[PDB]
Amino acid sequence: NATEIRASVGKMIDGIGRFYIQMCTELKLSDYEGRLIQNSLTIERMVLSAFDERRNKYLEEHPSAGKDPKKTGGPIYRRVDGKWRRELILYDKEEIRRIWRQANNGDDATAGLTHMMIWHSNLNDATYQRTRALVRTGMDPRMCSLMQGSTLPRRSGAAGAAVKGVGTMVMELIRMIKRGINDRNFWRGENGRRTRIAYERMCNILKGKFQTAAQRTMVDQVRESRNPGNAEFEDLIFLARSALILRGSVAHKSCLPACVYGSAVASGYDFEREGYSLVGIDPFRLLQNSQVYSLIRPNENPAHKSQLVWMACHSAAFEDLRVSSFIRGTKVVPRGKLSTRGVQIASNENMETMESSTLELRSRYWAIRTRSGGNTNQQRASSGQISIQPTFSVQRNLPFDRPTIMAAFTGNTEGRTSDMRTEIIRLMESARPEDVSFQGRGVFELSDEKATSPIVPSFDMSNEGSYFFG
Amino acid sequence: NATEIRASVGKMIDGIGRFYIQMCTELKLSDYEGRLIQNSLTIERMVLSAFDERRNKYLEEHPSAGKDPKKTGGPIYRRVDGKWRRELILYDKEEIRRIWRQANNGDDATAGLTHMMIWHSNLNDATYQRTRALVRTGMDPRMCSLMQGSTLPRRSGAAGAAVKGVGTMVMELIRMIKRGINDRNFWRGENGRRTRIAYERMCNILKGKFQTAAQRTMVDQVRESRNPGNAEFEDLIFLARSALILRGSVAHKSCLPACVYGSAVASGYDFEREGYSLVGIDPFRLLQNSQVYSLIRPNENPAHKSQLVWMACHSAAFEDLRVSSFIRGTKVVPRGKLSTRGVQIASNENMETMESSTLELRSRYWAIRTRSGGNTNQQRASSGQISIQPTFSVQRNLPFDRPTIMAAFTGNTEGRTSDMRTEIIRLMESARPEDVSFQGRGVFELSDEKATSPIVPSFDMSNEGSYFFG
Amino acid sequence: NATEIRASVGKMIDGIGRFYIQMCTELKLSDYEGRLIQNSLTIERMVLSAFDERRNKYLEEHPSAGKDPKKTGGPIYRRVDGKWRRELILYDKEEIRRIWRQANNGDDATAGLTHMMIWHSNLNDATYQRTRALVRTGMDPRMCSLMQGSTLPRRSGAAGAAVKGVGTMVMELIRMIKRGINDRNFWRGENGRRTRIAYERMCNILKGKFQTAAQRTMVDQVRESRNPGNAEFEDLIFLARSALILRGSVAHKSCLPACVYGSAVASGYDFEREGYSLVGIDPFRLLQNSQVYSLIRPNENPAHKSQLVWMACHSAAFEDLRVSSFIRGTKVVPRGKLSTRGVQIASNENMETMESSTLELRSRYWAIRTRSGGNTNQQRASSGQISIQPTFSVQRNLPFDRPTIMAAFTGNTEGRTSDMRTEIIRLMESARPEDVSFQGRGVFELSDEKATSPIVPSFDMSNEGSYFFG
RNA sequence: UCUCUCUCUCUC
RNA sequence: UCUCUCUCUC
């Protein structure tokens, strides 16, 4: 059933919106100041710093960074008669802990935490990607496309684990491998056992993320190494560059600004009654009647800022620019010529130059965002019946495909990673930049609610550039 | 997290400083005597000898060099009413081993030991470059800029592996290749196993140090030779010659003399609380308020000696003279016209001519020392995405940059080294000596603590000479 | 490390000394008979006839030369109450081989074979220059200074190949290419395959011994010729004419008379304990208290013979007469006015004519025979830093000397040998006969052991002639 | 080398 | 070939 999930997510976002309402009440902010992204951003880093129970425990025993008992940051932006001023107001964690506890009807609301931290990961991926760490581990900077959910720490649950990219897991596992290579950390002690456990948890997350059997089997065999040394490093680099084309089925969770939920809840649009969804039309129509104000530099233009905000909201920074333009209806400028900077404001920037203005989030069309892969993999390896089920009692042979059943069970088990790298190479050669994917699905219009009739897009606009970076 | 590494480095430097305080207590030296470079050098080389297990174990089975059961060296210099005296005082290994034992709260302090070996590597690289071994191996002494950490023994760990450079690894590999050519050391004995293990580990370190893909793949094809003969000899020479321009980001650890650390520790500046960094402003901020004395010959210029010792402390002997002078604030004299000699003093030179004086270490500016390479390599090979991820479920093509996809995989595996020499010489031809590097970075002022605003240098002083040697 | 090398050196020279002692044992010779250079010469020639496995294997299948089953030569001289007698005593190979086996504790002592062959090469080069070979090859007899180690056979190892001079290598290359011109030996048979491996190895030695890179390139381009004809003949000729001034650092190994080692070992001076070297003070310190007797014709000058024996022992046949006179302390007579003959005695000369007399070997000073070249080549082509190592991350250009790095790679590969001949000619024009050498090295006094202080010689005796030949 | 291998972010 | 052309080095 899907009604229960819809009711749960509706209750969750209703609690989130009511917490936004109460923060607006408590902060004594104006109507316009309650529609600013910066305030929600700072408040949500406060949120994560209050539920980072692991870091709370680590910092209680580590009283450093000067005045840091329980309070961090808090750069609240306020308006005086047109001009803007930032105040470093410090809030302790504990009162906000109870205000959450009262905001979710006595519950902890950790799922909402996962969605906000994922949405921060989405905005981080949209704004800046780290080739710095990517080459710190030595991996080439060609794979910036697989840094989805990179900023997400381990503390998130399964829902958070679903949206993290393959490359994020590759980076996280290489960090552990390099740490275990630097020092003899895999001893029979509890630390070794726990890092072992986290390792297989991250690995079965990985093998769940993939779709084709060959990469799942080679991930299975990578596990067989009890002592991760140097060979596994290139083994999993080969895994990553294979996932470049044999991409993993990674979800795209549609989270929206802290305010958008608050404005919707304040108007009385209860999500429990009519139901809510995270993949369907819902986050699209809530943005159809949402007003958002933002802060812009004297050199920054708002036109690219609105598009970057739409990137951050819908996590489409790693998608084709042409498709995003089609749903937008306007051309989406790649990051090469974006005359803008990061959304977050540096702590040293002056305030006389800063100017606030609206953001455009209206889109002409809407589309479903499933956690599936391109149809090209199914074209390379088709599907269908593998055996037959006897129905009538008639003397006959029972057909069964031996060369497929034996290959599924791998009667002669693979010896190392290179033998499967051979099929990786032949699949890559079979792959083409022409194979059309997502057959049977299309882009839909706003006026339709039940997914009745789509329109098939068709682009012949040469080589405008389907690459957000470079 | 960076707090844990900061605490660890602060702890081990505090241990080193309080060991130096213990040495100053036990040696019964005056206040000026503990501000001498020479006595710190003597005690520090003594520590190197005491903690070097391999040479020791080679020595108790080899009772040679006359008086050598367990005591070596020890030329302690003492000021006698203005004059100086040198005494050859001999110390046991176990006593000072245990003095370290409580000098670090029961730990081995391997990281501190690596710090001392690295600081020795910097002093040797600043004073004398080993053209002699280069010509011995037939290797051109034009490339002394590849001799980072040549005096380092192989006992240094991963932290020590970070600092030892590409050309030094070429030299040590050439040594082992010459040894294996002289005699058949490649048999199936345990010696052959340890040789191949060391050889593959050192090749892994090499492939870690390089940046461009072509050199990495050529090195990966280097160790395919199970029986290294003569071809890999010129292969490695050409590796060094190509790494001349495509340099590897090895390391430039800013190690400081034990006297400076001891003076800071004695004053009560505990490093654990406020933190320590070896790469940022921190190793710099101790030096503008540091007093250092040293002995000088009646012909040596103290002004040159201060510049040379600041070079050795900051390991800037292979850095360009223009920027080194800009950061220092005064012109730096190249090795050609230095009216000074090595900071180490000969054991046979007379006692009368030595004169002590203060060493100038204060510098006008500061800069961060990143372990990276010039931007010119990224100019030759640009940056950007290679793959895309489907965010919306739309029936569309998945753009893949196929010709670079083969390039990463090398579908047609390289036949030999020569095909790689071809395009690497092509890249060398594409290189220009006017390529500005390190974009987006600059030199900051001492009043800056958080790296808020740098100033970009601009050198138009003709051809003063960006070559410390020659 | 050098301790193991000195220990091994002491080991095999101690074995050789004990072998000579036991020769004195079962030869039933007197004390004076054990101090005769020619007895050592004859015994050691019988030894080489015993240890020439290739020559033996060529010999048993060819039973010629009358009484030659296993016994060759053996002209032993004995004193009969003042007079002299010569007897042709024949010994087998196997018992001598077994005595060597028992003399080096069951080892083959191939290093001793190499050293004895090197001593023979120095003796023959000092005595007679085979200008007949030069005229047969057509190479002019003014190049006899490049005849170092001509008598050496191919069977010598890497140490034996080290002393072999450039001219001798050119000679066997001319011989082999002439043989390849006479008949079609370059066919696909195994003989041609061993031919090409030998030719390539000799070319590797050729590129090894020189110092300047342009000749490396020229000799490498000589080697690529799959069919060496008359052009490569001329190429090697020009290589010799270039190597006259661009001398290769071949070797100057100082091997000495077996009688001297036997006398030293018999006295109880163990070389393994105190260490021994073939380049340092050791060969100098043993000869100051060594007595050697030799046979002299009724016309031969004993004063000339002592000097010739000392020069042959120290391998100064191609050195400077003036420097030899300085190191010896007395004037060295050139070959033009030597009133002596070859050390070895002809088999037909009568026994009544020659008389025994002492040989003077003591020298006033001692020096070091380094395996390097004159400083003039480094004056023509200097040394220094060519590339810059970025230490501090600063927005700057990273200089690299393009006109030198490109010249190192030779981006436009050399067309033929003539283009390199052109730069050889211009370097010859830049060459001068007044280029001083030993800038920092000098001749030392005997009383010093640890290489403390030199005296720089100054020769102003006009034009006595620094030419041992002519 | 998590005190910055490039597109810049106080955010660990 | 560790006792060392090269700018010093126990």
Author numbering:
A (entry chain C), B (entry chain A), C (entry chain B): 21 to 490
Task: Kindly provide excerpts from the paper associated with this entry.
Influenza virus genome encapsidation is essential for the formation of a helical viral ribonucleoprotein (vRNP) complex composed of nucleoproteins (NP), the trimeric polymerase, and the viral genome. Within each vRNP, the viral RNA (vRNA) segment is encapsidated by the viral nucleoprotein (NP) and attached to the heterotrimeric RNA-dependent RNA polymerase.
Therefore, we performed a local refinement focused on three successive NP protomers along the same strand (called later in the text NP−1, NP, and NP+1, respectively) (boxed region, and C). Here, we observe that residues R150, R152, R156, R355, and R361 most likely interact with the RNA phosphate backbone and that Y148 and F458 may interact with the RNA bases, while residues Q149, K273, and R391 are in the close vicinity of the RNA and could also be involved in its binding. Observation of our structure indicates that an RNA molecule of at least 10 nt is required to bridge the NPs together at the NP-NP interface and thus to form the RNP helical architecture.
